[PDB]
Amino acid sequence: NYEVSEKAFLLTQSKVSIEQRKEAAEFVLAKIKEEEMAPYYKYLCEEYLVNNGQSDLEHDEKSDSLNEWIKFDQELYNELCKKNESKIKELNEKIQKLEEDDEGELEQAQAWINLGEYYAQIGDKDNAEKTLGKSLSKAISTGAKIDVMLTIARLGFFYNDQLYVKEKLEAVNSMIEKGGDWERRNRYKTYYGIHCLAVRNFKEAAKLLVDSLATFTSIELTSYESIATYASVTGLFTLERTDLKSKVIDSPELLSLISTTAALQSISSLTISLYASDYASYFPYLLETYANVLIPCKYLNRHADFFVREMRRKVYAQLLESYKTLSLKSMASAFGVSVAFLDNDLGKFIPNKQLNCVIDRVNGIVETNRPDNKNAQYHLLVKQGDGLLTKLQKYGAAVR
Template structure:
């Protein structure tokens, strides 16, 4: 078992704070983000990363200095001096190990050097050093840990190609005999990757499966992990599973007092309080989706899909509804509901039609015979493909 604590290297809170600081729409969070960002840079001696982000940012304009991270030359000098001294010490230690010690000591020194380059945010040198450490690592557990560290480098720099490549390597190594702890940590890594590329269903399955076994604090806090599970689950689970896996889950209920908007979202959706659900969804967008480096690219998509889910849930219960009653249920104007429902119907996202003369929305359920026919054709194609594959083997 992997009993040692996995250090947050690189620290993923650092790019999250930089994202907040760089987003003008999150001005109310800038002061806190800047303070925590500088604390993280100093704590991990992130000279290379600090130089790269300050050179990439344009000089702050008058009145907008809180939106930028200006270069503090004295801070950079002190960080780079600390980096130079530590790397010199590690290089000397590696040279001595190669002369007088065994493979285990050399491997440990290579890993220490790679981890330091990872911690300070020197992407290219860190990747090169981690690959060398991986080649020299003896045990399967050590190799898995190094591969997962490279995945975190990919997360840190938002490099999807690195994440995809090394996630596959981690899965292969764990299938060879990874322990329980590393298997569970990989679930969290995979869930974060899936939600970052808008695969909410696959992310929800992994988040919810790992709720009771979560240990991956090196990539995400427990509260944020639960929030991601609720966000993805609310969109992809049916009513029965939403109640069973989210609303009544003890891990979720443990976090709800600190993030009450999550409880408002799922409970009002489940209990069909759609006006309150809309308020909770708007609050979630502003307080959690947009401020999240991972979720902000998907915020508009998520809000739209959740609205469609709520509209469909209500329309499924009735053959017809007046536009006025539909608007009242969601706490919006008739004009708003008319425009939005019309757009979703036109895009085939809702099975309904609007009678504007009488102000009625009529539910149109898809033909069950057509659905059965499509199922038979689809399953028949699969069966024929399997038969053809079998015939090639036999003959």
Template sequence: MPEDVVLPIPNLALPQSLFVLSKPHLSHLHDNARKELLEGIKADQMAPYYRSVTAANALPADAALLEEMEAANTAELARLDTQLEEAEKMEGESDIADALQARANHFTRIGDKERAVEAQNLALEKTAGMGSRIEIVLTLVRIGFFFGDFDMISKNLAQAEELIEKGGDWDRRNRLKVYRGVHLLSIRQFKRGGELLLDALSTFTATELLSYNDFAAYTIIANVLTLKRVDLKKKLIESSDIIQVLPELPTLADLMKNLYDSHYDKFFLALATLEQTHLIPSRLLSPHTRFYVREMRILAYSQLLESYRSLTLDSLARSFGVSEEFVDNELSRFIASGRLHCTIDKVHGIVETNRPPLKSAQYETVIRQGDILLNAVQRLSKVLY
């Protein structure tokens, strides 16, 4: 296999379909997910994966289909084993490495995790070319994504980074940014993950991991939350790479434009739509839905409150298109947790901002972090002495 050909294996659309089928509240998406899952399994003859999927009752078991796929898997493995034997007898080390990699890719394609990982690691040991070694490690990362194995993802991302530092080319460096960015989003590190995705926006080639539209959606979702207002316009709203996909991502277009333009009632509607269409149904983002929606609301409230010393609850509620009771309850929670710097005068129906001076805020941060450090040192000293 030429080094510049990246096989899209395993098919990462399938665990997304399986995730949807595992959620009863996404029943309106089940028919399409079931169809895509079965078609993907048939296309790659994924007998081992089909067995696990039917065992979980995500698809009805079809004994004839399973038998047909297992026969195809056995025949293909026999062919690859013969190819490997011939390479070991007649060919050089590079041909043996290619045969090992082809065998590993077979197990990866059909969704046999244990044999795929073992075979990929063996191929890695026998492969000399730096580019091919990096590709094998990135394939192991994708296997980790496919099966939701975070330890495997972290371990192989670190290994890929080491290899790329030793001799990775421009394309693989950029693809690694996407892999790392997606992983960081999956563990709720939106700021660093968003930075990496944004950095790879104009050079995206990691189509074996996700489609460009999904990549653009993740880039917008992460960076709307973390970018400053001036950067939001410069790096997202006015980005030609983002502009070209916005017609296919109307909810995300509404979200960032209405936040930037301070149309908070429309922003809240877009956020609610985003929650239902992009967050809850997403295998990657679903665990972080409540966190993301809360943080986006805090961001919008903060942005509005920064413009005023005080404003009435009524005007605040009208700005967001919600009731006074809703705003009162939500602001109370965020104020109590220290996320919003304001007070509510319930008698007069007024919200007054009380942002601490910058130096005072920095001083409080230093004191708080200093206390944490001192406590850690004290605990360590007890262990050592």
């Protein structure tokens, strides 16, 4: 589900190279011919239509495509159909035969989790939901929460559905609440981390996601690579540096991870650069990580130019605080960049106001503004208390 979706994401988010799409489409070809998955193939094709993966043999015929493993065949409709006929037939006989015996009050539920597996493997939206609610209706043990939680999470990761996986997780957790198993706690948090980066709040996501295990795997409900890379990056991104030297300089799982695969570059290399303070090494390295790791991932292309801009801003921001008198001419010249880049994107940062950078661009000097007899607090409090005052005026608008 994960491995389907991830490489599906990889095709659709292709613009970098030929092989980025090509490898995606082949793995998707392998998978779509492995098991019946026609309507989620259909979606993929539709979603990257009028692009450069528009080749098909059932709803659009174009040869301008750079892919040809996003094509239908009608050979699909002999495999899909015999598998679906066997499965529906076998399971109708199961539910029928069980009910007829008057056997179980969970075996009816097991028969419908089976149908739910069956439907989430084809990629169905409504068929899977409507079967699964049956098992939760014939609840009599905490077993029902565990099964419900696994199947909603499977559909979610395949489609990229947010909303009924989110409602259904929340709805089921209060259905009976004791926090369940350990394993279920990690899943519950991690999905929540998705949700808060998806509405876009940033920090809220980190609170659940980083505290989620960074070695959690269940193959297709998330892999080891996925959870860990996602934790580590959001980690860096929305957190202060006290957190970073504590936790995002190493988890001992990450050490072991990066040993086997070079798909991280964010617990080791970028952290160490940032702590030493660079722009010669740090911004090059950001770009390389960005292309290779970030755009490929489903949830690191979802904070895009914010990742890039806040993190170049953060290294600049900490260098500002150590150097009261900073030569923008020396830095921009010789610190592994050119004058015009450093000056114009610095000038971009400044009225977003995440800096106390007292700038002259052409003289090539920057100085540094203390809070002193402005505070941060005196002025900030000075207009926060007017938040309070408006709501009482609002109350005294309406009165009795």
